[PDB]
Amino acid sequence: PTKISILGRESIIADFGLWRNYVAKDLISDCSSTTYVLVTDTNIGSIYTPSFEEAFRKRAAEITPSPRLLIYNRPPGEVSKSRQTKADIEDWMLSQNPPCGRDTVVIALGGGVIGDLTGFVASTYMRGVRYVQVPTTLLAMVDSSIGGKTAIDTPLGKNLIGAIWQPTKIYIDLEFLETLPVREFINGMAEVIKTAAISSEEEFTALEENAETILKAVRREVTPGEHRFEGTEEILKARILASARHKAYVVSAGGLRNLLNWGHSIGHAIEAILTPQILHGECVAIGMVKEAELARHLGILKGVAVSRIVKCLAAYGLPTSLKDARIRKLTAGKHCSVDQLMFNMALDPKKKIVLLSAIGTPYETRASVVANEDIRVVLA
Amino acid sequence: PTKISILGRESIIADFGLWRNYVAKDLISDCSSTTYVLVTDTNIGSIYTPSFEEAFRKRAAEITPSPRLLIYNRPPGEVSKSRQTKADIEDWMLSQNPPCGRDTVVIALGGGVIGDLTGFVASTYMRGVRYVQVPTTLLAMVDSSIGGKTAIDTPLGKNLIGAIWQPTKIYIDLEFLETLPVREFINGMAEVIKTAAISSEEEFTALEENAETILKAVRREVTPGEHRFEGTEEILKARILASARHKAYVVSADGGLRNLLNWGHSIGHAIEAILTPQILHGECVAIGMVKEAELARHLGILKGVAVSRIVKCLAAYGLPTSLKDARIRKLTAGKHCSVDQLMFNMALDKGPKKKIVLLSAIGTPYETRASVVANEDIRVVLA
Ligand SMILES: Nc1ncnc2c1ncn2[C@@H]1O[C@H](COP(=O)(O)OP(=O)(O)O)[C@@H](O)[C@H]1O
Ligand SMILES: Nc1ncnc2c1ncn2[C@@H]1O[C@H](COP(=O)(O)OP(=O)(O)O)[C@@H](O)[C@H]1O
Ligand SMILES: [Cl-]
Ligand SMILES: [Zn+2]
Ligand SMILES: [Zn+2]
Numbered sequence A: 001p002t003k004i005s006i007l008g009r010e011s012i013i014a015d016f017g018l019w020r021n022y023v024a025k026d027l028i029s030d031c032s033s034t035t036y037v038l039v040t041d042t043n044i045g046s047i048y049t050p051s052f053e054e055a056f057r058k059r060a061a062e063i064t065p066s067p068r069l070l071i072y073n074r075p076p077g078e079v080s081k082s083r084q085t086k087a088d089i090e091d092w093m094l095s096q097n098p099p100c101g102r103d104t105v106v107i108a109l110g111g112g113v114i115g116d117l118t119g120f121v122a123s124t125y126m127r128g129v130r131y132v133q134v135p136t137t138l139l140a141m142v143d144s145s146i147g148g149k150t151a152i153d154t155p156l157g158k159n160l161i162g163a164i165w166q167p168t169k170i171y172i173d174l175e176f177l178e179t180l181p182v183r184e185f186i187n188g189m190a191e192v193i194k195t196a197a198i199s200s201e202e203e204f205t206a207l208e209e210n211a212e213t214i215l216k217a218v219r220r221e222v223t224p225g226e227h228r229f230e231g232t233e234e235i236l237k238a239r240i241l242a243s244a245r246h247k248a249y250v251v252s253a254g255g256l257r258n259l260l261n262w263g264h265s266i267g268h269a270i271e272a273i274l275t276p277q278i279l280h281g282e283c284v285a286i287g288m289v290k291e292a293e294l295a296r297h298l299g300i301l302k303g304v305a306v307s308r309i310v311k312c313l314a315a316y317g318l319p320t321s322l323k324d325a326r327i328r329k330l331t332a333g334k335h336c337s338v339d340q341l342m343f344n345m346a347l348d349p350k351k352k353i354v355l356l357s358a359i360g361t362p363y364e365t366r367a368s369v370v371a372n373e374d375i376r377v378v379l380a
Numbered sequence B: 001p002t003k004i005s006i007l008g009r010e011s012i013i014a015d016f017g018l019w020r021n022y023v024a025k026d027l028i029s030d031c032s033s034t035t036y037v038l039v040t041d042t043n044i045g046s047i048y049t050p051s052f053e054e055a056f057r058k059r060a061a062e063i064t065p066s067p068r069l070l071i072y073n074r075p076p077g078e079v080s081k082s083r084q085t086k087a088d089i090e091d092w093m094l095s096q097n098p099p100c101g102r103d104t105v106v107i108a109l110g111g112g113v114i115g116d117l118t119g120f121v122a123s124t125y126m127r128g129v130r131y132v133q134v135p136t137t138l139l140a141m142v143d144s145s146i147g148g149k150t151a152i153d154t155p156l157g158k159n160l161i162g163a164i165w166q167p168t169k170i171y172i173d174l175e176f177l178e179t180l181p182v183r184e185f186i187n188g189m190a191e192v193i194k195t196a197a198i199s200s201e202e203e204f205t206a207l208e209e210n211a212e213t214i215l216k217a218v219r220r221e222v223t224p225g226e227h228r229f230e231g232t233e234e235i236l237k238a239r240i241l242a243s244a245r246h247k248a249y250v251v252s253a254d255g256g257l258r259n260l261l262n263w264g265h266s267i268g269h270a271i272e273a274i275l276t277p278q279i280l281h282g283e284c285v286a287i288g289m290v291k292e293a294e295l296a297r298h299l300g301i302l303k304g305v306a307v308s309r310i311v312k313c314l315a316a317y318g319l320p321t322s323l324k325d326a327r328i329r330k331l332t333a334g335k336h337c338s339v340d341q342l343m344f345n346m347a348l349d350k351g352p353k354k355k356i357v358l359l360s361a362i363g364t365p366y367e368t369r370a371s372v373v374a375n376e377d378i379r380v381v382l383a
Helices: A018-030 A042-061 A083-094 A112-124 A138-144 A174-178 A182-197 A201-219 A233-251 A264-274 A280-297 A303-315 A325-330 A338-346 A372-376 B018-030 B042-062 B083-094 B112-124 B138-144 B174-178 B182-197 B201-218 B233-252 B265-275 B281-298 B304-316 B326-331 B339-345 B375-382
Strands: A002-004 A012-015 A035-041 A068-074 A105-110 A130-135 A149-154 A157-164 A169-173 A350-353 A356-358 A368-371 B002-006 B009-015 B035-041 B068-074 B105-110 B130-135 B149-154 B157-164 B169-173 B353-356 B359-361 B371-374
Touching: A002 A233, A012 A018, A012 A233, A018 A042, A018 A130, A018 A169, A018 A174, A035 A042, A035 A112, A042 A068, A042 A105, A068 A083, A083 A112, A083 A149, A083 B083, A083 B149, A083 B157, A105 A112, A112 A130, A112 A138, A112 A149, A112 A157, A112 B157, A130 A138, A138 A174, A138 A182, A138 A233, A149 B083, A157 B083, A157 B112, A169 A174, A169 A233, A174 A233, A182 A201, A182 A233, A182 A280, A182 A303, A201 A233, A201 A303, A264 A280, A264 A338, A264 A350, A280 A303, A280 A356, A280 A372, A338 A372, A350 A372, A368 A372, B002 B233, B009 B018, B009 B233, B018 B042, B018 B105, B018 B130, B018 B169, B018 B174, B035 B042, B035 B112, B042 B068, B042 B105, B068 B083, B083 B112, B083 B149, B105 B112, B112 B130, B112 B138, B112 B149, B112 B157, B130 B138, B138 B174, B138 B182, B138 B233, B169 B174, B169 B233, B174 B233, B182 B201, B182 B233, B182 B281, B182 B304, B201 B233, B201 B304, B265 B281, B265 B339, B265 B353, B265 B375, B281 B304, B281 B359, B281 B375, B339 B375, B353 B375, B371 B375
Parallel strands: A012 A169, A035 A068, A035 A105, A105 A130, A130 A169, B009 B169, B035 B068, B035 B105, B105 B130, B130 B169
Antiparallel strands: A002 A012, A149 A157, A350 A368, B002 B009, B149 B157, B353 B371
């Protein structure tokens, strides 16, 4: 297994089959406790909780008295990232017999949604209890689960109420990617490509090479009794952990974290308009394409560089323009006026944007100051 | 202005009239921001918010842009220390124009209730924003506001959901004690006496001396224009800050030192679980100290003379020393506390023995932590 230290500690454990042969075991020995609370939605749970309850029983049998495994399932969707669901899980935990104590270890089994909710639930339960991250979406494995940022949503916006509570462990089991819907896998790929583009040319080239292969496995129908990523196993692990590693690196450090926002400046503006029909990664993809175009316009990025960005994103199934087909269909031709975008970008004179002087090489070691008029030029 | 440092840094500012001449000023200069949110109940607010709005305007006038002061008032009582109340305070914060942001400085103006709620609201607002403590109750000045422990209550218990969020500043304005109801003042005195009893025989001795005087000012009519603690001003500040200082000390100490802060609380908590909400926390802890002291004596660790002074000193301040005290009896229609019930409530605290803070003498703890004691030995003092 591959370990990626984060914040001066071992937190991340990444490899195939962790949820089957490792997690349970490791939790009982490194996260000693009498109460383990697994949280997940009905989609990912029905697929993975059974194998775990069993794997759990085997490890708990050897310990006495036997540690209990409590499970909580919530409806899928970001509808659970609410004040209501959090209170529930809390009252449910307090209603257990005996009530779940401060020794509780919470297991966040899911994506960004389950992740933020559970992480925040843990941070405040009796003023905080330990918890581990078990990212099931690609976007969660390389980004959302690394960092400790947790929160829920309110009818006035996303992530408005939450906390920064570092998970004790972060289990990255690449096998979760075997059942992850194709669209979701592609969505996460945006951040992976983003990470490379702001840190390593060689890594961005690896992504360029592997694209065809990865996408073949991600789409090919897999007959029961086989692994979706049969021969590409090592390639996938390398490309995905590279991103996770970077996120972990940045999180362990000032202006280095701003770079994690490349493509997000414009990206966020687009999403504010096209969500929830269009996904985060899908919007960031178009965001990277434009911010790259902005870098070119400002004379900081070369034409050749800009093309590969687009080419590489497309190669993975990500949208590169607001004019894309799918997007236009999924959003019945919604339109992002150059103004509404500049309005949104401000909801966050001049704008701060991450510019690239070349693939793998950031212009400044932080978000560069850019003038509005210069931004408005790449928004059409 | 006397300053006490907590957790390796200044935070506590203690003196008279801070709410009138200091707070506002200091907030604008040391807690620079565009949004300040004052939270309080309708009891303490109606008495103190007006003078503050004004004091605020004066300081904000010089600085430009103008730092806005938003105010939130909730019904008094621990009924506001709820998920709902917290949620409103937040939606209200997000609904302002423009919405309260991460630069926000929250002002917790009130007692333990307002303190815990606001402190917790702050800890999670956009994943955390700065906040200051402005303890208006005695119990809050020397205990609840020092430490960073925040939370709300749920129908299944107190302080079940919350967080540990250290306040940026802790303004201890002794003038709040001029309007604090007599009962509340006496309530807080329990913890002050507790602090002394576990750290300084001298400090305890002074408490015994200053009693008769303090209680005179607390229980007297103050004609218009006169400060309630006219001549005793320095005495009060000394006695009160001594406790606050200790709390600050323990809280900054890098284990069992925090256990000592639980003296009288072992039995004390058991009693409160039964007699609350009619009887207050301090009032229950008082009886708790009396009994735990009796337990120490029984176990041969505390002398008879020592135990007496404890009782005498608590009484001297108007605190109950036994469950048979008439004031209690009245407030609880004579509710009974079975030893069985008390021993059970003491177990709800996560066997054959209970851990209790024992004193070998006033100011001197037996062990540097909660000593292990057998059930039968505890049951004897309760009978
Ligand atoms: N490994 C997986 N296999 C199957 N379904 C999954 C997996 N991961 C999550 N899902 C489902 O996919 C959708 C997207 O997960 P979500 O947590 O919303 O994504 P993100 O982390 O991008 O916010 C949800 O409907 C969820 O139940
Ligand atoms: N400085 C003060 N003077 C007058 N009223 C106050 C003051 N402090 C708080 N109060 C009121 O006194 C009561 C006790 O405050 P609370 O915070 O509930 O107590 P504690 O801190 O002991 O838990 C409340 O009804 C409150 O509105
Ligand atoms: Cl909360
Ligand atoms: Zn992102
Ligand atoms: Zn107490």
